[PDB]
Amino acid sequence: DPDQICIGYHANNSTEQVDTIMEKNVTVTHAQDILEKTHNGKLCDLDGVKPLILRDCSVAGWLLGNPMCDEFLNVPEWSYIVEKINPANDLCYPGNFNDYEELKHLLSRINHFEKIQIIPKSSWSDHEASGVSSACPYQGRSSFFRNVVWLTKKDNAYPTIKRSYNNTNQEDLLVLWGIHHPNDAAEQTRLYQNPTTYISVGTSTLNQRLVPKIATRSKVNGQSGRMEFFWTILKPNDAINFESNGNFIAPENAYKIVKKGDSTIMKSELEYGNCNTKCQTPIGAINSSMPFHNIHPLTIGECPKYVKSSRLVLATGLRNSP
Amino acid sequence: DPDQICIGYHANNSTEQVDTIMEKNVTVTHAQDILEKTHNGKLCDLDGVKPLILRDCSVAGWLLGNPMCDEFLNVPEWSYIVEKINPANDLCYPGNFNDYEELKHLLSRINHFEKIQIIPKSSWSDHEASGVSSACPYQGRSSFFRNVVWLTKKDNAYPTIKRSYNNTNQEDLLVLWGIHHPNDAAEQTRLYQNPTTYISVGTSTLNQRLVPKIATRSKVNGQSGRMEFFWTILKPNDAINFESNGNFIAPENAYKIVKKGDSTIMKSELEYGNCNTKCQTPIGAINSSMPFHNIHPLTIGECPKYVKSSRLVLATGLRNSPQR
Amino acid sequence: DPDQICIGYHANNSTEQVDTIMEKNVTVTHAQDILEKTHNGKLCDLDGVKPLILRDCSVAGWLLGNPMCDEFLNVPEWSYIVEKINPANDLCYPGNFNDYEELKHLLSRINHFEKIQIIPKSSWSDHEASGVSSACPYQGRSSFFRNVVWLTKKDNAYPTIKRSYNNTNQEDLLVLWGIHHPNDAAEQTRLYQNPTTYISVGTSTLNQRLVPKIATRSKVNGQSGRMEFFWTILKPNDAINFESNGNFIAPENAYKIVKKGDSTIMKSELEYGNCNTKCQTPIGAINSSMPFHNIHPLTIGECPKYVKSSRLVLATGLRNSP
Amino acid sequence: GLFGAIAGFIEGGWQGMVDGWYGYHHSNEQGSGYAADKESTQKAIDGVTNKVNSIIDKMNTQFEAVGREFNNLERRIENLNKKMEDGFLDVWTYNAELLVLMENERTLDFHDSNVKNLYDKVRLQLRDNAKELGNGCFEFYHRCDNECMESVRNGTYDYPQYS
Amino acid sequence: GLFGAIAGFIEGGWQGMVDGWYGYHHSNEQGSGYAADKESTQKAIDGVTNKVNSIIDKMNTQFEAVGREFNNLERRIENLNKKMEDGFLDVWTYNAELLVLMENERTLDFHDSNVKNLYDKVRLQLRDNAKELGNGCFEFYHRCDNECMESVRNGTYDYPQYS
Amino acid sequence: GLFGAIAGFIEGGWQGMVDGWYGYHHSNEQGSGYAADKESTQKAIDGVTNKVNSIIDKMNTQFEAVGREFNNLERRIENLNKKMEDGFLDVWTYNAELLVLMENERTLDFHDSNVKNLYDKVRLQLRDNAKELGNGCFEFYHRCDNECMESVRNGTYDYPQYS
Numbered sequence A, C: 001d002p003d004q005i006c007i008g009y010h011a012n013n014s015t016e017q018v019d020t021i022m023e024k025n026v027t028v029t030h031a032q033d034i035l036e037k038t039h040n041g042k043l044c045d046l047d048g049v050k051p052l053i054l055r056d057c058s059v060a061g062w063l064l065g066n067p068m069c070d071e072f073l074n075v076p077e078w079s080y081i082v083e084k085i086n087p088a089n090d091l092c093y094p095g096n097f098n099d100y101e102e103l104k105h106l107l108s109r110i111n112h113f114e115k116i117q118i119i120p121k122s123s124w125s126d127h128e129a130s131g132v133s134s135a136c137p138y139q140g141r142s143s144f145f146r147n148v149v150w151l152t153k154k155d156n157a158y159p160t161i162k163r164s165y166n167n168t169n170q171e172d173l174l175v176l177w178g179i180h181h182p183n184d185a186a187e188q189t190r191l192y193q194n195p196t197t198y199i200s201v202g203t204s205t206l207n208q209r210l211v212p213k214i215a216t217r218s219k220v221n222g223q224s225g226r227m228e229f230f231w232t233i234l235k236p237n238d239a240i241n242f243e244s245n246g247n248f249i250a251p252e253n254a255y256k257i258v259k260k261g262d263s264t265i266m267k268s269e270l271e272y273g274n275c276n277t278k279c280q281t282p283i284g285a286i287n288s289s290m291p292f293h294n295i296h297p298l299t300i301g302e303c304p305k306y307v308k309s310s311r312l313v314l315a316t317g318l319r320n321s322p
Numbered sequence B: 001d002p003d004q005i006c007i008g009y010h011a012n013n014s015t016e017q018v019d020t021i022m023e024k025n026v027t028v029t030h031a032q033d034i035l036e037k038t039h040n041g042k043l044c045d046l047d048g049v050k051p052l053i054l055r056d057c058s059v060a061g062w063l064l065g066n067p068m069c070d071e072f073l074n075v076p077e078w079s080y081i082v083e084k085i086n087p088a089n090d091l092c093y094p095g096n097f098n099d100y101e102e103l104k105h106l107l108s109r110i111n112h113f114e115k116i117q118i119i120p121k122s123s124w125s126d127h128e129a130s131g132v133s134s135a136c137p138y139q140g141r142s143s144f145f146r147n148v149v150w151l152t153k154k155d156n157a158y159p160t161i162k163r164s165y166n167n168t169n170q171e172d173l174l175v176l177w178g179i180h181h182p183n184d185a186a187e188q189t190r191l192y193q194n195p196t197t198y199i200s201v202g203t204s205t206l207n208q209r210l211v212p213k214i215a216t217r218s219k220v221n222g223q224s225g226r227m228e229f230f231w232t233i234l235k236p237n238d239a240i241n242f243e244s245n246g247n248f249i250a251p252e253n254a255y256k257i258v259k260k261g262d263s264t265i266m267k268s269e270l271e272y273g274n275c276n277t278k279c280q281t282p283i284g285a286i287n288s289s290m291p292f293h294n295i296h297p298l299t300i301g302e303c304p305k306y307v308k309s310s311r312l313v314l315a316t317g318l319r320n321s322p323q324r
Numbered sequence D, E, F: 001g002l003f004g005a006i007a008g009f010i011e012g013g014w015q016g017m018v019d020g021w022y023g024y025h026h027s028n029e030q031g032s033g034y035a036a037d038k039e040s041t042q043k044a045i046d047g048v049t050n051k052v053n054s055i056i057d058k059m060n061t062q063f064e065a066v067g068r069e070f071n072n073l074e075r076r077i078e079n080l081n082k083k084m085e086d087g088f089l090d091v092w093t094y095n096a097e098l099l100v101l102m103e104n105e106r107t108l109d110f111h112d113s114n115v116k117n118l119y120d121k122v123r124l125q126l127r128d129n130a131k132e133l134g135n136g137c138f139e140f141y142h143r144c145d146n147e148c149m150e151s152v153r154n155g156t157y158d159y160p161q162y163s
């Protein structure tokens, strides 16, 4: 019957649970999830800029011009680059790309090349410039990389090559060339006439002199021969000078570095998703205002911070009584 | 005289102490030590698998077959490898091992080799294969590495060598070979006849052409000459092709990689402890249920987490203050 | 009114503010700043020991003896070394220094060299030893690095060089030498007579045979030729052996390593402050009792711990009521 | 919690009090009702919202993994790179998880404390004018109408008027 | 600690109560004895055990150093490797030591809080029927036999029955 | 604060008590004055000084950045180096800032707690012999001279003498 005032606290229908040091699964009136756990499974444009999806081609295959990579002869500017784990179209003619990983690292800071001619085919009057291999098929016939040229002897002679290019452009220039390592001495003279050969390359900083290596090697893509490729960055107003008396895989085209910025090379099996995002991972894009996510450690864009947590929930309300 | 009830708390004879931010050496009724601070000072088997104790031999000495390392010619499966900081028996004939550290990295993921003869010593008809050095003694006589062969001229001729080995096994094969760097031009022709030489090696991935380096060098183990060793992993069904007109230290034996798993190369001065453990460190084994330990940062097996702390003790009971 | 006693706490005129998790800008009666935010903007002696300020010279320029770096022919013991981002006096004769970064790492643990002669100029009776270049001016005239010698042919002859040096000192010895890369075959014979040359170098651990590389190169400091420099540490009682029939830039002076300890190579544009400190940064010295600072991460001496924070203030007193 | 109010002397929460986190249930002749306390609820919202923002802002400059590639003979540096990246991710995962656990505990104690403080504010205001049942309630001696209940929440409550 | 009971108003602990962490001493006509409060003791045992497990389980993804070897001309990366591994060892040593310290402090305050809460649980039951001595003891106005004492410990003490 | 004494039932601090951190303001026939409590103020200085020093000392083995140089074709390891160093710097900046933030809150709560404990130390001594105002003040029923005030402050107050 007598009057009374009570002190009490809010309860509701919430079944939200949070954790503490001393207690797990504490039911609270209000909670705030701060961990993004979902992605769209797609490779998207990053803030309106399409990525470069190399499909079945590697960065090597792209830049050198593997005949199977013609899709990528003059790509537009990209936001990020996507490469498969083991791209089928790489070095069609077997060999290797010198300092390949350091080159890929530079790519991570580049958004656009403009490919230009630096040595025209019309330059080669005293050499054969149409060398091909069945290791580089195109349309079921022997072909070769599009951006470099296989020079061989003409009229049973290989006179010494002297070639210069001055970078008159305002941009740095990525230049590529290679050396051919033959199978034996007979092959050496058959292709190049001269038994003892070299390629010397100089700039203001480069001081290179390569000599081919004959060795007996296993067939890779049908061929025991090998090509080893090299690269330099040619600064504006500097010039590159090549000299060779054989085994020279000569430049034809090189790449002006026209746009630098944030980029990355993502490894992914995913294809293009015809979508736009502000945050991309190799397994899918993220659209979230969560401060954290657990999708993948490698991201590009405006992203939540990655943690390995399966759950992150902050208590905001109070302990909710049943 | 009137009845009463009191509220209070537990006290005991405990002198256990813990620390907080605001105070140190707080006496508590109960505490829980969570730091393992002791070890057995032995090198033990890991989960019943014996380690490979290299004693006075290095990894190079073992693999190349330094005559001082005959104990390790055909070793059984190991759990981890133990090597001294400065092994006495290394490259008996002085020189170096190319990409040695990368090879040792590979070993960290290998548990067993099956060593096989790939090129018989007796199969060299046009070359001498019995080259020895006082830099590699064995029973007080000039000897040489067991797993590679020192080829020299025969009848004042060193014809061009062309040898191939096809890996017909199902396992990866570790192949070793080397080059000899002579003291001078006279020694070059005395040993190999041809003044200008090379070794070419090719696989599906390897494209090597070595040329000897003549230089005037200090005596190491009594010899001014040098041998430089190389290695590759030959995949199943791939083949290795050697060509040379001199200075070739040819493979005899190579190593089938038969068991791959978790391993490590541990640096320690200790010997085998006739003992078994779940957790091993370079200074002793750990048998503990503590969550932490401070023994040594480098461990293999099922181990507590390493910290640099001298002390970790959690308060469990309360502030111990008995009435006096 | 009968007698009374009240409980209360201190309040003052303080406007000192601290932060907590739930609250920002909390007024307290007492607070303690634990973050040092000021430096003297100078490069000082570290605990009474002057740094080596290389000014416009690089480490390479210093050690090889670029004539523009004569100030540093025999420097006294140092506490740390200061080098500019882009020192103008480096390799006066263009080229490079092999494993230069690894050499600089060694330098970080060295406080003093004593430079000694290991091969005198008088040793060269069968070769010309006065080779100079306009790329290495001294007083505006053609000159050369002080510590190595450019040997060229004498009487149209370059006989095979054989030199040994036994380290009879009790200290490790830093030994420097180089190879010259000429412009063409004609220049090779003009300087060295022999067309096919080598430099062989051996110690107890070193086994080196260098061969020159002819390439067509851009002019740097007026010269298209190149010099490539090498180094080794010669142990007490070991010996170094040189053999060459051309292109050899021979040692004259080498460096005994007489004092090892804590040092660093500091990148700074500052110069000597005529000053003394216990803690030095590339942008200025610190005189503080704070446990933390935010001046710069790269310090030497007895220093506060570096943090990126703009503000660190601990509450000591209590909440200051209005 | 540490303050013995939420699930302490006050056995449970109220479904009926929708207006705020903390408040009062009264029972008089005019009719029983639920009224949330304005200041303490608002204070708690300000404190909790700030705690959230502080936690987010402190993680603002976490580690960011970058793809680096290595060749067949750079295994040691590849392994080094991987362990370094995994290392920082583990460190920051730990930091995030631990901070949340620790602050979740503090938030619950904070609410618990706020409840007790409100109970004591009523207790010290009433003193002799009301009985203390011990279940978080105060039995009145005199019949307190709506105007009496109002003065308690405001802090206007004149003790000398009722004694 | 912060709650002012342990080394507060109850001046010291009882060696005679070997029964649990917190409890009662009664003395009436039938005799006297100690008795642990079962729920608050079991409550504290649960929280402290969980705290211990949480500290252990939070560290489980700790850094683990790996032996890596470098040659004479790989000194920069050797140093990088060393400083990196030492770097993580120091980070995790700090995390372990600091967590233990902060949680030791919370554990002691937790106990202090539990005693205070237990004292209040009794205080709110007794009210007018017993005198609050201030030393942690209450002196009964009426006679309280063993079953009466048991109901106090129970939280089933019947107030109207004795007043 | 969590204990509701600082900016709680005691409305504000005293400008006039420039003596210590926590104290008394007595009034009797002989006059009025401010006197600080020695035990609690000294306890506060010791705990706070120990806190400051522990925080400094736990940071003692912080990461230290070392300048490393790399050439034009070591860009990957250069970048690895930079990220590792910035990584540790960020980890230790976070550790430092977070520790200060967390301990600042605990410090202010620590002060609040001491005032609260000091209030209870007096209340449990006086009991029925004095009225509790709720202001942070106790009104004496009997006369308390300067020597009597000394007994309250020292803790030597005698209850059966006045009851």
Ligand SMILES: CC(=O)N[C@@H]1[C@@H](O)[C@H](O[C@@H]2O[C@H](CO)[C@H](O)[C@H](O[C@]3(C(=O)O)C[C@H](O)[C@@H](NC(C)=O)[C@H]([C@H](O)[C@H](O)CO)O3)[C@H]2O)[C@@H](CO)O[C@H]1O
Pocket (backbone or CB within 6 Å): A130, A131, A132, A133, A134, A135, A142, A150, A152, A181, A182, A183, A187, A191, A222, A223, A224, A225, A226
């Ligand atoms: C079973 C058998 O022995 N059949 C031989 C068969 O090998 C031979 O094929 C040619 O063999 C040579 C090596 O000896 C090359 O492999 C040839 O392939 C090509 C290639 O496609 O790459 C042909 C190509 O036109 C050549 N291009 C140029 C510019 O020279 C290249 C090139 O020489 C090599 O790649 C250099 O390493 O080689 C392959 O056709 C056939 C036909 O001659 O004869 C059988 O008796």
Ligand SMILES: CC(=O)N[C@@H]1[C@@H](O)[C@H](O[C@@H]2O[C@H](CO)[C@H](O)[C@H](O[C@]3(C(=O)O)C[C@H](O)[C@@H](NC(C)=O)[C@H]([C@H](O)[C@H](O)CO)O3)[C@H]2O)[C@@H](CO)O[C@H]1O
Pocket (backbone or CB within 6 Å): B130, B131, B132, B133, B134, B135, B142, B150, B152, B181, B182, B183, B187, B191, B222, B223, B224, B225, B226
């Ligand atoms: C002071 C002096 O001149 N004393 C010579 C003394 O040098 C010489 O001994 C021979 O010296 C040569 C170097 O010129 C080698 O050091 C010889 O050592 C061996 C070795 O044991 O390693 C002998 C061995 O049988 C050789 N093995 C093979 C397969 O050739 C090797 C090998 O040639 C070299 O190591 C290659 O670098 O060398 C050592 O006997 C003696 C005898 O001639 O005469 C003194 O006057």
Ligand SMILES: CC(=O)N[C@@H]1[C@@H](O)[C@H](O[C@@H]2O[C@H](CO)[C@H](O)[C@H](O[C@]3(C(=O)O)C[C@H](O)[C@@H](NC(C)=O)[C@H]([C@H](O)[C@H](O)CO)O3)[C@H]2O)[C@@H](CO)O[C@H]1O
Pocket (backbone or CB within 6 Å): C130, C131, C132, C133, C134, C135, C142, C150, C152, C181, C182, C183, C187, C191, C222, C223, C224, C225, C226
């Ligand atoms: C347009 C034109 O042809 N003008 C020539 C001009 O080239 C030439 O200058 C000489 O050119 C040579 C290269 O062919 C060198 O660059 C000469 O410079 C020096 C130098 O300063 O380095 C001179 C020095 O005395 C030489 N020192 C030694 C030890 O040999 C060096 C050295 O040969 C090179 O550096 C090695 O690479 O070269 C430079 O004088 C002049 C004079 O012939 O005539 C113009 O008409």
Ligand SMILES: *[C@@H]1O[C@H](CO)[C@@H](O)[C@H](O)[C@H]1NC(C)=O
Pocket (backbone or CB within 6 Å): A013, A014
């Ligand atoms: C919980 O309550 C809210 C409103 O208070 C209501 O909208 C919702 O349907 C309820 N949820 C459940 C699962 O009953």
Ligand SMILES: *[C@@H]1O[C@H](CO)[C@@H](O)[C@H](O)[C@H]1NC(C)=O
Pocket (backbone or CB within 6 Å): A024, A025
């Ligand atoms: C509650 O916590 C336990 C671990 O204590 C967990 O296994 C469970 O999945 C959690 N949530 C449930 C059952 O909804």
Ligand SMILES: *[C@@H]1O[C@H](CO)[C@@H](O)[C@H](O)[C@H]1NC(C)=O
Pocket (backbone or CB within 6 Å): A166, A167, A237, A238, A239, C218, C219
């Ligand atoms: C390239 O051309 C520019 C302008 O014609 C010239 O000034 C420069 O010296 C040239 N660079 C080289 C390396 O010859």
Ligand SMILES: *[C@@H]1O[C@H](CO)[C@@H](O)[C@H](O)[C@H]1NC(C)=O
Pocket (backbone or CB within 6 Å): B013, B014
């Ligand atoms: C404390 O008591 C135990 C008996 O339970 C005894 O073993 C121990 O030695 C005692 N510690 C002393 C006396 O210091």
Ligand SMILES: *[C@@H]1O[C@H](CO)[C@@H](O)[C@H](O)[C@H]1NC(C)=O
Pocket (backbone or CB within 6 Å): B024, B025
């Ligand atoms: C307790 O701590 C002090 C310093 O805080 C130290 O000197 C002492 O060795 C510690 N332990 C003892 C006395 O057992």
Ligand SMILES: *[C@@H]1O[C@H](CO)[C@@H](O)[C@H](O)[C@H]1NC(C)=O
Pocket (backbone or CB within 6 Å): A218, A219, B166, B167, B237, B238, B239
């Ligand atoms: C090695 O032998 C197998 C089986 O005879 C053969 O198929 C394979 O081509 C050989 N490999 C090489 C690289 O020659």
Ligand SMILES: *[C@@H]1O[C@H](CO)[C@@H](O)[C@H](O)[C@H]1NC(C)=O
Pocket (backbone or CB within 6 Å): C012, C013
């Ligand atoms: C602030 O207070 C101090 C005493 O603590 C006094 O000395 C000083 O004059 C005051 N400052 C101002 C500006 O009033």
Ligand SMILES: *[C@@H]1O[C@H](CO)[C@@H](O)[C@H](O)[C@H]1NC(C)=O
Pocket (backbone or CB within 6 Å): C024, C025
């Ligand atoms: C108080 O905090 C604000 C914003 O949080 C900040 O801008 C300012 O520096 C602080 N102090 C002031 C305004 O005196």
Ligand SMILES: *[C@@H]1O[C@H](CO)[C@@H](O)[C@H](O)[C@H]1NC(C)=O
Pocket (backbone or CB within 6 Å): B218, B219, C166, C167, C237, C238, C239
């Ligand atoms: C250098 O000289 C010392 C003393 O004369 C001698 O013992 C040593 O063998 C020499 N070192 C070499 C590599 O010949």
